[PDB]
Amino acid sequence: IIGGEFTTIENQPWFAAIYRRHRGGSVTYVCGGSLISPCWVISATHCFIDYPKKEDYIVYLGRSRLNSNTQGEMKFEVENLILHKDYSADTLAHHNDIALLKIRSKEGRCAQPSRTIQTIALPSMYNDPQFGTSCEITGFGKEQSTDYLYPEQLKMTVVKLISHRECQQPHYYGSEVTTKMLCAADPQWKTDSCQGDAGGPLVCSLQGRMTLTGIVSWGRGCALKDKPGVYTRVSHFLPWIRSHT
Ligand SMILES: N=C(N)Nc1ccccc1
């Protein structure tokens, strides 16, 4: 997250921190995800496409720090890693960038709600906030495009939804963005998601209900003029989610 503010897990209790084991046993951060139900975390396919093996991943819930445990956090194994079969990757635009991870602890249990662990509601089909609406994003991604390290403390910021016509414009992303995608950014391009934030949630208040409107997917650089963050439009993949869950 470029700009924005630091936060702890209680301000995004459905945020999931996903890591991967390497040969030798070293563990590195992979991407963010969102708990949509006790046993299910939704993320982005591009995060796992190069390493499809579910056994290599570890998922944490109620975790506020990148490399240090958070009191009360839960650790999970990935019982099933479901990627979207229609996934595609272009110059930058990832299509159908959505994935599902079925979590299971070593005790064979799913998530246990608490003050630091809760689920986020899915939107109604094809029901998104009006463009210009302010929503929030969360993640452990870079704080600066040139940074080498990722922040140790979770972060969040606010970005406004951009209309498809605006984003489809030449100056923006042209045709790289589709109806199954949502663009969002700061009117001053001061804050935005960045490398490491993929898979994370774009949450909007829709009719008094915090809703998982999008999933951090892609973008040209970070916090650059006319280059918004692009998000998987969740309200357009409900049938997919339904069946796979
Ligand atoms: N918001 C962005 N400009 N770029 C971006 C970078 C990395 C992941 C997701 C989105």
mmCIF file of C-alpha atoms and ligand atoms in Angstrom:
data_model
loop_
_atom_site.group_PDB
_atom_site.id
_atom_site.type_symbol
_atom_site.label_atom_id
_atom_site.label_comp_id
_atom_site.label_asym_id
_atom_site.label_seq_id
_atom_site.Cartn_x
_atom_site.Cartn_y
_atom_site.Cartn_z
ATOM 1 C CA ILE A 1 0.000 0.000 0.000
ATOM 2 C CA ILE A 2 1.391 3.368 -1.151
ATOM 3 C CA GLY A 3 0.478 6.116 1.321
ATOM 4 C CA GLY A 4 -2.474 5.367 3.567
ATOM 5 C CA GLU A 5 -2.057 4.339 7.191
ATOM 6 C CA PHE A 6 -0.909 1.473 9.356
ATOM 7 C CA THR A 7 -3.541 -0.650 11.039
ATOM 8 C CA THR A 8 -3.928 -3.837 13.031
ATOM 9 C CA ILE A 9 -6.006 -6.907 12.264
ATOM 10 C CA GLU A 10 -9.076 -5.810 14.247
ATOM 11 C CA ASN A 11 -9.698 -3.181 11.564
ATOM 12 C CA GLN A 12 -9.848 -5.845 8.803
ATOM 13 C CA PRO A 13 -10.511 -9.097 10.775
ATOM 14 C CA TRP A 14 -11.208 -10.991 7.540
ATOM 15 C CA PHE A 15 -7.797 -10.262 6.059
ATOM 16 C CA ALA A 16 -5.762 -13.399 5.411
ATOM 17 C CA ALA A 17 -1.968 -13.455 5.196
ATOM 18 C CA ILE A 18 -0.753 -16.145 2.791
ATOM 19 C CA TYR A 19 2.814 -17.517 2.749
ATOM 20 C CA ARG A 20 4.638 -20.365 0.940
ATOM 21 C CA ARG A 21 7.280 -22.866 2.091
ATOM 22 C CA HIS A 22 10.423 -23.229 -0.032
ATOM 23 C CA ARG A 23 12.768 -26.178 -0.494
ATOM 24 C CA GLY A 24 14.772 -26.161 2.712
ATOM 25 C CA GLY A 25 11.802 -24.819 4.627
ATOM 26 C CA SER A 26 12.150 -21.032 4.318
ATOM 27 C CA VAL A 27 8.805 -19.174 4.380
ATOM 28 C CA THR A 28 8.067 -16.058 2.308
ATOM 29 C CA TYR A 29 4.947 -13.901 2.036
ATOM 30 C CA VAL A 30 2.834 -14.553 -1.064
ATOM 31 C CA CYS A 31 -0.340 -12.472 -1.103
ATOM 32 C CA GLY A 32 -3.353 -11.331 0.859
ATOM 33 C CA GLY A 33 -6.797 -12.931 0.884
ATOM 34 C CA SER A 34 -10.219 -12.426 2.464
ATOM 35 C CA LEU A 35 -12.148 -14.820 4.702
ATOM 36 C CA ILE A 36 -15.594 -15.222 3.138
ATOM 37 C CA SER A 37 -16.576 -18.156 5.357
ATOM 38 C CA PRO A 38 -15.054 -20.248 8.196
ATOM 39 C CA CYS A 39 -13.356 -22.623 5.750
ATOM 40 C CA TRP A 40 -12.858 -20.341 2.766
ATOM 41 C CA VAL A 41 -10.394 -17.632 1.824
ATOM 42 C CA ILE A 42 -10.763 -15.842 -1.507
ATOM 43 C CA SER A 43 -7.713 -14.417 -3.283
ATOM 44 C CA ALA A 44 -6.234 -13.896 -6.772
ATOM 45 C CA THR A 45 -5.103 -16.715 -9.083
ATOM 46 C CA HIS A 46 -1.943 -14.948 -10.301
ATOM 47 C CA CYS A 47 -0.669 -15.310 -6.733
ATOM 48 C CA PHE A 48 -0.468 -19.086 -7.032
ATOM 49 C CA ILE A 49 -0.294 -19.784 -10.759
ATOM 50 C CA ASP A 50 3.454 -20.589 -10.706
ATOM 51 C CA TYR A 51 3.184 -22.933 -7.683
ATOM 52 C CA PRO A 52 -0.190 -24.766 -7.863
ATOM 53 C CA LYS A 53 0.712 -27.272 -5.129
ATOM 54 C CA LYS A 54 -1.542 -26.602 -2.120
ATOM 55 C CA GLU A 55 0.859 -28.304 0.309
ATOM 56 C CA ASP A 56 3.394 -25.505 -0.015
ATOM 57 C CA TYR A 57 1.103 -22.802 1.380
ATOM 58 C CA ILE A 58 0.353 -21.551 4.874
ATOM 59 C CA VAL A 59 -2.485 -19.151 5.654
ATOM 60 C CA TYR A 60 -2.800 -16.985 8.756
ATOM 61 C CA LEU A 61 -5.925 -15.291 10.095
ATOM 62 C CA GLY A 62 -5.936 -12.563 12.735
ATOM 63 C CA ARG A 63 -2.336 -11.665 11.858
ATOM 64 C CA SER A 64 -1.299 -7.979 11.955
ATOM 65 C CA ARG A 65 2.431 -8.349 11.235
ATOM 66 C CA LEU A 66 4.434 -9.700 8.301
ATOM 67 C CA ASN A 67 7.248 -11.534 10.063
ATOM 68 C CA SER A 68 6.111 -11.824 13.670
ATOM 69 C CA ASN A 69 3.181 -13.651 15.198
ATOM 70 C CA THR A 70 0.165 -11.680 16.407
ATOM 71 C CA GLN A 71 -1.393 -12.738 19.694
ATOM 72 C CA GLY A 72 -4.514 -14.758 18.935
ATOM 73 C CA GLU A 73 -3.666 -15.544 15.296
ATOM 74 C CA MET A 74 -4.590 -18.852 13.653
ATOM 75 C CA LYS A 75 -2.429 -20.882 11.260
ATOM 76 C CA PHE A 76 -3.914 -22.973 8.464
ATOM 77 C CA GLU A 77 -2.851 -25.414 5.775
ATOM 78 C CA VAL A 78 -4.462 -25.325 2.354
ATOM 79 C CA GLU A 79 -6.767 -28.312 2.009
ATOM 80 C CA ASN A 80 -7.627 -27.187 -1.524
ATOM 81 C CA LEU A 81 -6.244 -24.487 -3.820
ATOM 82 C CA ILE A 82 -8.847 -23.626 -6.455
ATOM 83 C CA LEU A 83 -7.745 -21.451 -9.370
ATOM 84 C CA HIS A 84 -10.007 -20.056 -12.086
ATOM 85 C CA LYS A 85 -9.736 -22.217 -15.198
ATOM 86 C CA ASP A 86 -10.396 -19.214 -17.433
ATOM 87 C CA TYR A 87 -7.454 -17.295 -15.967
ATOM 88 C CA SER A 88 -5.335 -15.441 -18.533
ATOM 89 C CA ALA A 89 -2.280 -13.206 -18.325
ATOM 90 C CA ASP A 90 -1.444 -10.354 -20.677
ATOM 91 C CA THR A 91 1.109 -7.531 -20.585
ATOM 92 C CA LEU A 92 -0.284 -6.519 -17.184
ATOM 93 C CA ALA A 93 -4.028 -7.206 -17.149
ATOM 94 C CA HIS A 94 -4.886 -10.550 -15.549
ATOM 95 C CA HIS A 95 -8.295 -11.927 -16.510
ATOM 96 C CA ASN A 96 -10.506 -13.842 -14.083
ATOM 97 C CA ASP A 97 -7.912 -13.190 -11.410
ATOM 98 C CA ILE A 98 -9.747 -14.990 -8.628
ATOM 99 C CA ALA A 99 -8.914 -18.030 -6.496
ATOM 100 C CA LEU A 100 -10.262 -19.933 -3.519
ATOM 101 C CA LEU A 101 -8.301 -21.581 -0.727
ATOM 102 C CA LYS A 102 -10.043 -24.068 1.550
ATOM 103 C CA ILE A 103 -8.295 -23.764 4.908
ATOM 104 C CA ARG A 104 -7.823 -26.444 7.563
ATOM 105 C CA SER A 105 -5.739 -26.304 10.739
ATOM 106 C CA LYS A 106 -3.524 -29.198 11.787
ATOM 107 C CA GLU A 107 -6.336 -30.005 14.214
ATOM 108 C CA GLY A 108 -8.501 -30.295 11.109
ATOM 109 C CA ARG A 109 -10.602 -27.224 11.869
ATOM 110 C CA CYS A 110 -11.640 -24.129 9.934
ATOM 111 C CA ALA A 111 -11.662 -20.531 11.184
ATOM 112 C CA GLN A 112 -12.979 -19.684 14.663
ATOM 113 C CA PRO A 113 -14.481 -16.155 14.701
ATOM 114 C CA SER A 114 -13.155 -13.751 17.342
ATOM 115 C CA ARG A 115 -12.280 -10.088 17.830
ATOM 116 C CA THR A 116 -9.413 -10.468 15.328
ATOM 117 C CA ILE A 117 -11.001 -13.034 13.012
ATOM 118 C CA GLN A 118 -14.275 -12.529 11.125
ATOM 119 C CA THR A 119 -15.773 -13.066 7.674
ATOM 120 C CA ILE A 120 -16.580 -10.396 5.078
ATOM 121 C CA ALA A 121 -19.870 -10.376 3.162
ATOM 122 C CA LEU A 122 -19.952 -10.966 -0.601
ATOM 123 C CA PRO A 123 -21.872 -8.446 -2.730
ATOM 124 C CA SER A 124 -25.194 -9.164 -4.476
ATOM 125 C CA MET A 125 -24.734 -10.172 -8.097
ATOM 126 C CA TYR A 126 -23.828 -7.267 -10.382
ATOM 127 C CA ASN A 127 -24.377 -4.896 -7.463
ATOM 128 C CA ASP A 128 -21.514 -2.409 -7.062
ATOM 129 C CA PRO A 129 -21.316 1.070 -5.482
ATOM 130 C CA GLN A 130 -21.691 4.127 -7.729
ATOM 131 C CA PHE A 131 -18.425 5.230 -9.254
ATOM 132 C CA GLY A 132 -16.757 7.876 -7.130
ATOM 133 C CA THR A 133 -17.650 5.900 -4.003
ATOM 134 C CA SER A 134 -14.845 5.680 -1.420
ATOM 135 C CA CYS A 135 -13.721 2.168 -0.459
ATOM 136 C CA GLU A 136 -10.767 0.698 1.434
ATOM 137 C CA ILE A 137 -7.911 -1.678 0.592
ATOM 138 C CA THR A 138 -5.627 -3.647 2.906
ATOM 139 C CA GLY A 139 -2.256 -5.364 2.564
ATOM 140 C CA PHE A 140 1.422 -5.919 3.387
ATOM 141 C CA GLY A 141 2.514 -4.644 -0.046
ATOM 142 C CA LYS A 142 5.312 -2.131 -0.709
ATOM 143 C CA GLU A 143 4.972 1.356 0.795
ATOM 144 C CA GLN A 144 6.983 2.773 -2.103
ATOM 145 C CA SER A 145 7.413 1.414 -5.624
ATOM 146 C CA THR A 146 11.207 1.506 -5.248
ATOM 147 C CA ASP A 147 11.149 -0.241 -1.875
ATOM 148 C CA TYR A 148 12.829 -3.639 -1.629
ATOM 149 C CA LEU A 149 11.230 -4.599 1.680
ATOM 150 C CA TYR A 150 7.568 -5.012 2.599
ATOM 151 C CA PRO A 151 6.148 -3.234 5.647
ATOM 152 C CA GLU A 152 6.250 -5.265 8.858
ATOM 153 C CA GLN A 153 2.913 -3.733 9.911
ATOM 154 C CA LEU A 154 -0.329 -4.204 7.991
ATOM 155 C CA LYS A 155 -1.666 -1.156 6.151
ATOM 156 C CA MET A 156 -4.847 0.173 4.600
ATOM 157 C CA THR A 157 -5.902 3.190 2.584
ATOM 158 C CA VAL A 158 -8.866 4.643 0.741
ATOM 159 C CA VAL A 159 -9.433 4.809 -3.010
ATOM 160 C CA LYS A 160 -12.409 5.909 -5.116
ATOM 161 C CA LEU A 161 -14.157 3.744 -7.707
ATOM 162 C CA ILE A 162 -13.629 4.774 -11.321
ATOM 163 C CA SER A 163 -16.175 4.155 -14.090
ATOM 164 C CA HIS A 164 -15.372 1.589 -16.772
ATOM 165 C CA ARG A 165 -15.609 4.317 -19.407
ATOM 166 C CA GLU A 166 -13.040 6.406 -17.587
ATOM 167 C CA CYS A 167 -10.692 3.462 -17.104
ATOM 168 C CA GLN A 168 -11.223 2.174 -20.641
ATOM 169 C CA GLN A 169 -9.933 5.512 -21.913
ATOM 170 C CA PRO A 170 -6.610 5.686 -23.845
ATOM 171 C CA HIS A 171 -4.792 7.705 -21.188
ATOM 172 C CA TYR A 172 -5.751 4.996 -18.699
ATOM 173 C CA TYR A 173 -5.790 1.273 -19.540
ATOM 174 C CA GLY A 174 -7.570 1.116 -22.882
ATOM 175 C CA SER A 175 -8.987 -2.379 -23.356
ATOM 176 C CA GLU A 176 -6.781 -4.084 -20.770
ATOM 177 C CA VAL A 177 -9.659 -3.572 -18.337
ATOM 178 C CA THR A 178 -12.978 -5.378 -18.773
ATOM 179 C CA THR A 179 -16.460 -5.383 -17.286
ATOM 180 C CA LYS A 180 -15.249 -8.106 -14.923
ATOM 181 C CA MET A 181 -12.793 -5.569 -13.490
ATOM 182 C CA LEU A 182 -13.071 -2.461 -11.314
ATOM 183 C CA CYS A 183 -10.617 0.430 -11.301
ATOM 184 C CA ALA A 184 -10.077 2.539 -8.207
ATOM 185 C CA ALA A 185 -7.633 5.280 -7.265
ATOM 186 C CA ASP A 186 -6.930 8.496 -5.408
ATOM 187 C CA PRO A 187 -8.035 11.685 -7.153
ATOM 188 C CA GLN A 188 -4.485 12.894 -6.507
ATOM 189 C CA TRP A 189 -2.913 9.494 -7.261
ATOM 190 C CA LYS A 190 -1.286 9.778 -3.804
ATOM 191 C CA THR A 191 -2.224 6.343 -2.434
ATOM 192 C CA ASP A 192 -2.799 2.955 -4.036
ATOM 193 C CA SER A 193 -2.103 -0.764 -3.846
ATOM 194 C CA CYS A 194 1.329 -2.010 -4.934
ATOM 195 C CA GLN A 195 3.454 -5.151 -5.284
ATOM 196 C CA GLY A 196 2.594 -7.523 -2.461
ATOM 197 C CA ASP A 197 -1.012 -6.322 -2.077
ATOM 198 C CA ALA A 198 -2.505 -8.682 -4.679
ATOM 199 C CA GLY A 199 -5.273 -10.980 -3.505
ATOM 200 C CA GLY A 200 -6.183 -8.480 -0.799
ATOM 201 C CA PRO A 201 -9.652 -6.955 -0.287
ATOM 202 C CA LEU A 202 -11.231 -3.838 -1.722
ATOM 203 C CA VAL A 203 -14.060 -3.287 0.746
ATOM 204 C CA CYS A 204 -16.952 -0.898 0.209
ATOM 205 C CA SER A 205 -19.943 0.062 2.330
ATOM 206 C CA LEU A 206 -22.911 -0.978 0.251
ATOM 207 C CA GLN A 207 -26.258 -0.271 1.904
ATOM 208 C CA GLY A 208 -24.838 -0.133 5.420
ATOM 209 C CA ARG A 209 -22.968 -3.365 4.809
ATOM 210 C CA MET A 210 -19.193 -3.705 4.531
ATOM 211 C CA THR A 211 -18.824 -5.735 1.337
ATOM 212 C CA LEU A 212 -15.995 -7.509 -0.491
ATOM 213 C CA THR A 213 -16.439 -5.513 -3.708
ATOM 214 C CA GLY A 214 -13.060 -6.311 -5.209
ATOM 215 C CA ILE A 215 -9.821 -8.277 -5.005
ATOM 216 C CA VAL A 216 -6.494 -6.521 -5.560
ATOM 217 C CA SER A 217 -5.405 -7.708 -9.019
ATOM 218 C CA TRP A 218 -3.108 -5.495 -11.116
ATOM 219 C CA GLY A 219 -1.984 -2.023 -12.144
ATOM 220 C CA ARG A 220 0.663 -0.137 -14.127
ATOM 221 C CA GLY A 221 3.311 0.677 -11.530
ATOM 222 C CA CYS A 222 1.893 2.078 -8.295
ATOM 223 C CA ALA A 223 0.244 5.404 -7.482
ATOM 224 C CA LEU A 224 0.963 6.723 -10.980
ATOM 225 C CA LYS A 225 -1.178 9.324 -12.721
ATOM 226 C CA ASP A 226 -3.910 7.792 -14.894
ATOM 227 C CA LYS A 227 -2.874 4.273 -13.852
ATOM 228 C CA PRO A 228 -5.450 3.142 -11.251
ATOM 229 C CA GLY A 229 -5.370 -0.044 -9.263
ATOM 230 C CA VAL A 230 -7.406 -2.731 -11.039
ATOM 231 C CA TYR A 231 -9.559 -5.185 -9.078
ATOM 232 C CA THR A 232 -11.413 -8.391 -9.804
ATOM 233 C CA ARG A 233 -15.088 -7.414 -9.787
ATOM 234 C CA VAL A 234 -16.431 -9.888 -7.230
ATOM 235 C CA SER A 235 -20.125 -9.288 -7.980
ATOM 236 C CA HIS A 236 -19.444 -10.802 -11.406
ATOM 237 C CA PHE A 237 -18.068 -14.143 -10.179
ATOM 238 C CA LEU A 238 -20.746 -15.261 -7.690
ATOM 239 C CA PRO A 239 -21.818 -18.365 -9.649
ATOM 240 C CA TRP A 240 -18.154 -19.369 -9.782
ATOM 241 C CA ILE A 241 -17.711 -18.838 -6.043
ATOM 242 C CA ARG A 242 -20.984 -20.609 -5.240
ATOM 243 C CA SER A 243 -20.153 -23.803 -7.103
ATOM 244 C CA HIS A 244 -16.523 -24.011 -6.035
ATOM 245 C CA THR A 245 -17.348 -23.491 -2.364
HETATM 246 N N1 LIG B 1 -2.678 -0.295 -7.888
HETATM 247 C C1 LIG B 1 -1.649 -0.477 -8.641
HETATM 248 N N2 LIG B 1 -1.259 0.599 -9.299
HETATM 249 N N3 LIG B 1 -0.758 -1.330 -9.073
HETATM 250 C C2 LIG B 1 -0.933 -2.719 -8.500
HETATM 251 C C3 LIG B 1 0.360 -3.284 -8.284
HETATM 252 C C4 LIG B 1 0.465 -4.615 -7.742
HETATM 253 C C5 LIG B 1 -0.724 -5.357 -7.426
HETATM 254 C C6 LIG B 1 -2.003 -4.771 -7.655
HETATM 255 C C7 LIG B 1 -2.111 -3.464 -8.186
#
